[PDB]
Amino acid sequence: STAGKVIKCKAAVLWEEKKPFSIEEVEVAPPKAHEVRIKMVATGICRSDDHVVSGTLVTPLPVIAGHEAAGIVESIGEGVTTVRPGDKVIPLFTPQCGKCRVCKHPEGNFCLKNDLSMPRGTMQDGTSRFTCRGKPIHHFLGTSTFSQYTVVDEISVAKIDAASPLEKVCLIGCGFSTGYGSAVKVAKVTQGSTCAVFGLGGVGLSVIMGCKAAGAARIIGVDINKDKFAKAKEVGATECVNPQDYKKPIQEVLTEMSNGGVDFSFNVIGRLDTMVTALSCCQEAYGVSVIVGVPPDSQNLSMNPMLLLSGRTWKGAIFGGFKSKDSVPKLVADFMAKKFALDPLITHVLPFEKINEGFDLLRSGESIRTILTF
Amino acid sequence: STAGKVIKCKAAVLWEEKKPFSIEEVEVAPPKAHEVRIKMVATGICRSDDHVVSGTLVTPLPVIAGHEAAGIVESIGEGVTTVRPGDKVIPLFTPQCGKCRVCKHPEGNFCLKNDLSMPRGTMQDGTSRFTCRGKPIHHFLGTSTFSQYTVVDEISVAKIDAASPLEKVCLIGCGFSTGYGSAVKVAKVTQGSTCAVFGLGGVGLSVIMGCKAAGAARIIGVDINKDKFAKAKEVGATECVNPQDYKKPIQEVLTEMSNGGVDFSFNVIGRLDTMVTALSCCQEAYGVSVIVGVPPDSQNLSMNPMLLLSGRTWKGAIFGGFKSKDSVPKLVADFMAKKFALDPLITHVLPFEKINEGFDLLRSGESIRTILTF
Numbered sequence: 001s002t003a004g005k006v007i008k009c010k011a012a013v014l015w016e017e018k019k020p021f022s023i024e025e026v027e028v029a030p031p032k033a034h035e036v037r038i039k040m041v042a043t044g045i046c047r048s049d050d051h052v053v054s055g056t057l058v059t060p061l062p063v064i065a066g067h068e069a070a071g072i073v074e075s076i077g078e079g080v081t082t083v084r085p086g087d088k089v090i091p092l093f094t095p096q097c098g099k100c101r102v103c104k105h106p107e108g109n110f111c112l113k114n115d116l117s118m119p120r121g122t123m124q125d126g127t128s129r130f131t132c133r134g135k136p137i138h139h140f141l142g143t144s145t146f147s148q149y150t151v152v153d154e155i156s157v158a159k160i161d162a163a164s165p166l167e168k169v170c171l172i173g174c175g176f177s178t179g180y181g182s183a184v185k186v187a188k189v190t191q192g193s194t195c196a197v198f199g200l201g202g203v204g205l206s207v208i209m210g211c212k213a214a215g216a217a218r219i220i221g222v223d224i225n226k227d228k229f230a231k232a233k234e235v236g237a238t239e240c241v242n243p244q245d246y247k248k249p250i251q252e253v254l255t256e257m258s259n260g261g262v263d264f265s266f267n268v269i270g271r272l273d274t275m276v277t278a279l280s281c282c283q284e285a286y287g288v289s290v291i292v293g294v295p296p297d298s299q300n301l302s303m304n305p306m307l308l309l310s311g312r313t314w315k316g317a318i319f320g321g322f323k324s325k326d327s328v329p330k331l332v333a334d335f336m337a338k339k340f341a342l343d344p345l346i347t348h349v350l351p352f353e354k355i356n357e358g359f360d361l362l363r364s365g366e367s368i369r370t371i372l373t374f
Numbered sequence: 375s376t377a378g379k380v381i382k383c384k385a386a387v388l389w390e391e392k393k394p395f396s397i398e399e400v401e402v403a404p405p406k407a408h409e410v411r412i413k414m415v416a417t418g419i420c421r422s423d424d425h426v427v428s429g430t431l432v433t434p435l436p437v438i439a440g441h442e443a444a445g446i447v448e449s450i451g452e453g454v455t456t457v458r459p460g461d462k463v464i465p466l467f468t469p470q471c472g473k474c475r476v477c478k479h480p481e482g483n484f485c486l487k488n489d490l491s492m493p494r495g496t497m498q499d500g501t502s503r504f505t506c507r508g509k510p511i512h513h514f515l516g517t518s519t520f521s522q523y524t525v526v527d528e529i530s531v532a533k534i535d536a537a538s539p540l541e542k543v544c545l546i547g548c549g550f551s552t553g554y555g556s557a558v559k560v561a562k563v564t565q566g567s568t569c570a571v572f573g574l575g576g577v578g579l580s581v582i583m584g585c586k587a588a589g590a591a592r593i594i595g596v597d598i599n600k601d602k603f604a605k606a607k608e609v610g611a612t613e614c615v616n617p618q619d620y621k622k623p624i625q626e627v628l629t630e631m632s633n634g635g636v637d638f639s640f641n642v643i644g645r646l647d648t649m650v651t652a653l654s655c656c657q658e659a660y661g662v663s664v665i666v667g668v669p670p671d672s673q674n675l676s677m678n679p680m681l682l683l684s685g686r687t688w689k690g691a692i693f694g695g696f697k698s699k700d701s702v703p704k705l706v707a708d709f710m711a712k713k714f715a716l717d718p719l720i721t722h723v724l725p726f727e728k729i730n731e732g733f734d735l736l737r738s739g740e741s742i743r744t745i746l747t748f
């Protein structure tokens with residue numbers, strides 16, 4: 001009975017910087033031409049959402065944030081072809097228009113229709129579908145998943161297997177696919193290779209999972225917090241190392257450990273230093289280092305281009321280099337064929353209403369991933 | 375009549391830093407086990423040789439320098455298999471032992487037996503084959519081509535077509551193959567792509583030649599010296615641009631010129647800034663920038679890793695990523711099949727004795743490439 005009209009619901013609104021989320025009553029306008037509207041069933045709490053809170057990921061406020069989710073379609077706008085009423089779905093914070101330079105390219109995925117580079121906090125048409133007390137509220141990354149209902153453009157949503165556990169596959173919306181993809185799509189880890197992951201939060205662990213998926217003989221986890229190590233070895237990390245145990249700087253140890261450098265390194269932290277370390281520790285002639293994480297601060301690093309001239313490759317990606325609308329339904333299909341498990345990434349589950357609690361568990365470094373449910 | 379014994383000849387000896395080369399009489403010891411000895415017919419004057427002179431490429435002195443050459447084998451040591459007496463050859467400043475981690479790898483070429491990283495200025499065995507007045511003199515990059523006679527290890531020499539004009543194919547020893555290879559092996563330039571070359575000396579021109587060889591629709595030459603432009607368009611550059619004509623910084627102009635960024639950029643200069651420019655000006659999602667040239671100074675650059683995170687790739691190479699002993703005889707074969715011309719790269723020819731004159735023509739930026747002949 002909701003199709004074609006306004007829905008009154010609860011959302012999590014960030015009125016301004018450095019404040020908690022307030023649960024407010026919200027009006028969600030119905031989907032216009034080429035727009036879908038979705039009943040959220042589960043959303044993950046990711047780092048970038050916290051960066052919205054500190055003001056270090058600059059997007060316009062007030063905003064309904066949140067970008068890692070799954071749910072079910074409530075209705076569709078005119079001429080929507082890719083999804084139907086009731087289809088389970090995952091919003092795509094990196095779109096796939098299928099028509100830009102980037103979408104047409106065989107390697108690229110950072111669709112030119114993205115809202116990441118200079119965020120507008122709107123739908124593709126320049127307007128908002130959310131009001132609170134008549135005050136309009138911005139979208140976030142064309143997703144905005146901190147709400148019982150959202151509306152997104154067709155190029156920001158993917159149909160998925162009608163039977164997927166939405167509490168679990170929502171991780172394919174961001175944290176999993178960002179890490180997994182960094183290893184299997186971007187870096188193209190190969191049989192028997194030696195990998196080295198920097199940062200053992202959930203993206204890092206998904207990287208490790210991507211490195212094991214490829215046939216890596218050695219997967220060296222690096223982190224300053226000991227407590228992250230069990231889980232990493234559980235997911236495939238053959239070895240772990242904590243830089244603060246050592247006298248020598250860690251690329252020096254990782255180089256002698258790997259007999260003159262690793263095949264593939266991954267920076268999954270988001271300090272500046274650690275990116276340089278990771279590049280240096282790969283084999284001088286043919287090593288590949290991948291930037292997964294970055295600080296949102298956006299600052300400049302210092303580095304010796306001698307490291308590249310010997311033959312090293314330094315690259316990075318968003319959303320694990322995955323073309324979003326092609327990839328997500330196959331990535332979920334791969335979960336249902338049991339070609340990897342998601343449980344290890346899910347440490348805390350909460351009702352949507354204790355969103356603020358979940359964000360306390362990320363800031364204290366206790367959560368790998370909190371899931372909010374509806 | 376020279377096989378198995380000492381040869382008295384002329385060489386160009388650098389007794390110390392920041393002095394001209396002196397023509398001295400030299401004793402060249404005969405080849406030991408697995409060593410070749412070569413009568414030079416032509417050597418090129420490259421930048422790195424001048425960097426030896428200023429003390430900015432640190433190798434031990436005194437030294438017979440020079441690394442871009444061809445010649446003819448005078449004799450061979452025991453158990454040498456790859457070459458015979460009288461075979462025309464090109465010394466390889468980057469070896470191919472065929473046995474290290476790097477040589478065994480399918481992408482790598484920076485053989486671990488190289489003398490580039492921490493130069494010893496010797497043969498592979500740790501000794502010198504050159505004396506002047508009984509004072510021993512170091513080798514350079516296991517080549518030392520500023521001499522009527524040299525001796526190199528078997529893994530630093532390549533047999534070539536018995537009919538090649540040695541005045542011309544010597545360029546495959548360094549400057550040509552460094553540029554050409556950067557485009558066709560390293561970067562893997564593709565059909566119809568948009569290329570952008572920074573620096574239009576002879577390596578840069580060889581890059582341009584490598585970009586035209588691949589099927590590039592657009593090849594944008596960049597240089598601060600107007601006078602380099604005719605030659606670049608001659609070799610395939612479809613367009614040229616001089617940053618000092620403009621108000622906007624050049625990646626900003628190159629970005630609007632290329633409709634949002636080039637497919638492949640190449641830094642072939644060796645300042646720090648220009649490497650960053652070149653990376654920035656390639657397309658954010660799928661662009662590839664290649665470091666060919668570097669300053670020998672070895673300093674640190676400043677850079678925003680946001681540029682990589684969007685999907686950019688930043689890599690570099692020595693000797694155009696070419697596996698030296700496999701590549702040189704096929705690269706020369708490709709010259710004799712007339713699949714590219716070398717004449718455009720050769721601006722000045724001189725007798726070996728006016729070596730100092732040729733080095734004056736590089737420092738004043740008048741030479742693209744001076745060839746010394748014997």
Ligand SMILES: CC(C)(COP(=O)(O)OP(=O)(O)OC[C@H]1O[C@@H](n2cnc3c(N)ncnc32)[C@H](O)[C@@H]1O)[C@@H](O)C(=O)NCCC(=O)NCCS
Pocket residue numbers: 046047048093174175198199200201202203204222223224225228243268269270271274292293294295317318319368
């Ligand atoms: C860092 C990213 C990848 C999230 O990763 P993750 O969820 O694993 O964050 P988390 O902090 O939990 O994990 C990083 C790990 O680094 C460790 N760490 C912190 N400092 C150090 C250090 N000096 N040395 C080693 N490890 C460290 C922490 O212990 C932690 O385990 C994310 O913030 C990011 O930068 N993504 C970039 C891509 C992007 O912007 N996409 C848009 C949607 S997110």
Ligand SMILES: CC(C)(COP(=O)(O)OP(=O)(O)OC[C@H]1O[C@@H](n2cnc3c(N)ncnc32)[C@H](O)[C@@H]1O)[C@@H](O)C(=O)NCCC(=O)NCCS
Pocket residue numbers: 420421422467548549572573574575576577578596597598599602617642643644645648666667668669691692693742
């Ligand atoms: C620079 C290298 C590649 C030699 O190239 P080349 O012979 O073309 O040198 P050359 O100076 O003639 O050419 C560079 C060009 O840059 C131009 N240039 C100088 N400054 C600028 C600037 N600010 N902007 C644009 N162009 C510039 C010059 O006009 C010149 O034409 C070489 O020095 C090098 O760094 N090689 C690294 C690999 C290596 O060490 N291998 C070992 C054997 S050499």
Ligand SMILES: [Zn+2]
Pocket residue numbers: 095096097098099100101102103110111112113
């Ligand atoms: Zn697109």
Ligand SMILES: [Zn+2]
Pocket residue numbers: 046047048067068174175
């Ligand atoms: Zn995320």
Ligand SMILES: [Zn+2]
Pocket residue numbers: 469470471472473474475476477484485486487
């Ligand atoms: Zn080798």
Ligand SMILES: [Zn+2]
Pocket residue numbers: 420421422441442548549
């Ligand atoms: Zn050279």
